Amino acid sequence: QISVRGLAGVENVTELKKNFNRHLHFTLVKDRNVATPRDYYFALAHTVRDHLVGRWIRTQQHYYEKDPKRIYYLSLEFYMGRTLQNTMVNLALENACDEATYQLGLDMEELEEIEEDAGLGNGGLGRLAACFLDSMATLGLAAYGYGIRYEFGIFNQKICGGWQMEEADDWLRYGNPWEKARPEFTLPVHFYGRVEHTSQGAKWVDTQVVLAMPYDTPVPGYRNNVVNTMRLWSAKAPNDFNLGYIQAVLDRNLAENISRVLYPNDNFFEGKELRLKQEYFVVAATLQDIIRRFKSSTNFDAFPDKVAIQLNDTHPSLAIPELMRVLVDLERLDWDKAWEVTVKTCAYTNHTVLPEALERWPVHLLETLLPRHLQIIYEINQRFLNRVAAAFPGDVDRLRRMSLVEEGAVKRINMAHLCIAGSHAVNGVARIHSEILKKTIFKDFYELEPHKFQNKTNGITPRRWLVLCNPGLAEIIAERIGEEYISDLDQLRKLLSYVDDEAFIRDVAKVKQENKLKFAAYLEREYKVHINPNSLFDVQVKRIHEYKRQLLNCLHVITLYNRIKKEPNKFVVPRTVMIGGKAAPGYHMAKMIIKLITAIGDVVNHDPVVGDRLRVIFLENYRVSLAEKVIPAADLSEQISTAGTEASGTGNMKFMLNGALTIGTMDGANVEMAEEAGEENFFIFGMRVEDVDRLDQRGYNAQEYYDRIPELRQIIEQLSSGFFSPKQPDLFKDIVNMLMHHDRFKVFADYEEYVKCQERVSALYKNPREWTRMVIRNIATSGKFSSDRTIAQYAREIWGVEPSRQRLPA
Ligand X SMILES: O=[N+]([O-])c1ccccc1/C=N/NC(=S)N[C@@H]1O[C@H](CO)[C@@H](O)[C@H](O)[C@H]1O
Annotated binding site for AMP: 31, 64, 292-297
Strands 412-414 vs 405-406: parallel, antiparallel or unpaired: antiparallel
User: Is 337 an annotated catalytic residue?
Assistant: no
List the one residue from 263, 303, 655, 732 that touches its own copies (CB under 8 A): 263
| CB-based contact 84:46 (threshold 8 Å) | no
Picked from ligand X, its own copies, none, the partner binding residue 244 (CB below 5 to 8 A depending on kind) is: its own copies
User: Is 70 an annotated catalytic residue?
Assistant: no
Q: Is 90 in the site for ligand X (CB under 6 A)?
A: no
Closest of 4, 24, 3 to residue 101, by C-alpha = 24
Picked from its own copies, ligand X, none, the partner binding residue 458 (CB below 5 to 8 A depending on kind) is: ligand X
Picked from ligand X, its own copies, none, the partner binding residue 233 (CB below 5 to 8 A depending on kind) is: none
Calpha distance 303→726 (Å, rounded): 67
Q: Is 31 in the site for its own copies (CB under 8 A)?
A: yes
Cα angle 267-270-275, degrees, rounded to a multiple of 5: 105
Calpha distance 754→664 (Å, rounded): 9
Q: Is 465 in the site for ligand X (CB under 6 A)?
A: no
Q: Is 244 in the site for ligand X (CB under 6 A)?
A: no
| CB-based contact 624:673 (threshold 8 Å) | no
Q: Is 668 in the site for ligand X (CB under 6 A)?
A: yes
Calpha distance 643→553 (Å, rounded): 15
List the one residue from 119, 177, 462, 803 that touches ligand X (CB under 6 A): 177
Q: Is 263 in the site for ligand X (CB under 6 A)?
A: yes
Q: Is 396 in the site for its own copies (CB under 8 A)?
A: no
Q: Is 322 in the site for ligand X (CB under 6 A)?
A: no
Calpha distance 794→804 (Å, rounded): 14
Picked from ligand X, its own copies, none, the partner binding residue 648 (CB below 5 to 8 A depending on kind) is: ligand X
Q: Which is nearer to ligand X, 559 or 662 (CB)?
A: 662
Question: Quick one: DSSP state of residue 808?
Answer: P
Residue type, 707: D
Q: Is 552 in the site for ligand X (CB under 6 A)?
A: no
Closest of 135, 82, 92, 118 to residue 650, by C-alpha = 135
Q: Which is nearer to its own copies, 293 or 506 (CB)?
A: 293
Residues 50-69 that bind ligand X (CB under 6 A): 52-53
Residues 6+ apart with CB under 8 A from 70: 63, 142, 143, 144, 290, 293, 306, 307, 308
Calpha distance 524→537 (Å, rounded): 16
Total residues binding its own copies (CB under 8 A): 50
Residues 424-443 that bind ligand X (CB under 6 A): 429
Task: For the chain, give percent helix, strand, coil, nearest 5.
Answer: 55, 15, 30
Picked from ligand X, its own copies, none, the partner binding residue 179 (CB below 5 to 8 A depending on kind) is: ligand X
Residues 125-184 that bind its own copies (CB under 8 A): 152, 155-156, 165-168, 170, 173-175, 180-181, 183-184
Instruction: Name the strand (E) or helix (H) holding 470.
Output: none
Residues 6+ apart with CB under 8 A from 748: 702, 705, 706, 709, 712, 739
Q: Cite the beta strand spans of 245-301 per DSSP E.
A: none
Question: What is the Cα gyration radius of the chain?
Answer: 27
x-marked contacts with its own copies along 668-707 as a string, rule CB under 8 A? ----------------------------------------
User: Is 493 an annotated catalytic residue?
Assistant: no
List the one residue from 21, 60, 208, 265 that touches ligand X (CB under 6 A): 265
List the one residue from 422, 580, 644, 649 that touches ligand X (CB under 6 A): 649
Calpha distance 201→570 (Å, rounded): 82
Instruction: Please report how the helices 751-765 and 550-566 are oriented relative to each other, as an axis angle in degrees rounded to 10.
Output: 70
Calpha distance 429→183 (Å, rounded): 36
Residues 6+ apart with CB under 8 A from 528: none
Q: Which residue out of 417, 464, 654, 773 is catalytically annotated?
A: 654
Q: Is 25 in the site for its own copies (CB under 8 A)?
A: yes
Residue nearest to ligand X (CB): 124
List the one residue from 56, 303, 339, 754 that touches its own copies (CB under 8 A): 56
User: Is 542 an annotated catalytic residue?
Assistant: yes
Calpha distance 208→193 (Å, rounded): 7
Q: Which is nearer to ligand X, 325 or 623 (CB)?
A: 623
Q: Is 440 in the site for its own copies (CB under 8 A)?
A: no
Q: Is 67 in the site for its own copies (CB under 8 A)?
A: no
Q: Is 188 in the site for its own copies (CB under 8 A)?
A: no
User: Is 543 an annotated catalytic residue?
Assistant: yes
Closest of 61, 89, 345, 115 to residue 229, by C-alpha = 61
Residues 568-587 that bind its own copies (CB under 8 A): 585-586
Closest of 665, 739, 732 to residue 701, by C-alpha = 739
List the one residue from 135, 229, 375, 650 that touches ligand X (CB under 6 A): 650
Question: Residue 678: how many CB atoms within 10 A of its CB?
Answer: 12
| CB-based contact 34:162 (threshold 8 Å) | no
Picked from ligand X, its own copies, none, the partner binding residue 627 (CB below 5 to 8 A depending on kind) is: none
| CB-based contact 497:483 (threshold 8 Å) | no
User: Is 433 an annotated catalytic residue?
Assistant: no
Q: Which residue out of 650, 662, 665, 772 is catalytically annotated?
A: 650
Calpha distance 89→6 (Å, rounded): 8
Question: Residue 441: how many CB atoms within 10 A of its CB?
Answer: 16
Picked from ligand X, its own copies, none, the partner binding residue 249 (CB below 5 to 8 A depending on kind) is: its own copies
Catalytic residues: 351, 542-543, 548, 650, 654
Which residues of this protein are in contact with ligand X, per CB under 6 A?
Answer: 26-29, 42, 49, 52-53, 77, 122-126, 128, 175, 177-181, 217-218, 263, 265-269, 351-352, 357, 429, 458, 646-650, 668
Which residues of this protein are in contact with its own copies, per CB under 8 A?
Answer: 25-26, 29-31, 36, 38, 50, 53-54, 56-57, 61, 152, 155-156, 165-168, 170, 173-175, 180-181, 183-184, 236-237, 239-241, 243-246, 249-250, 252-253, 257, 260-261, 263-264, 272, 274, 585-586
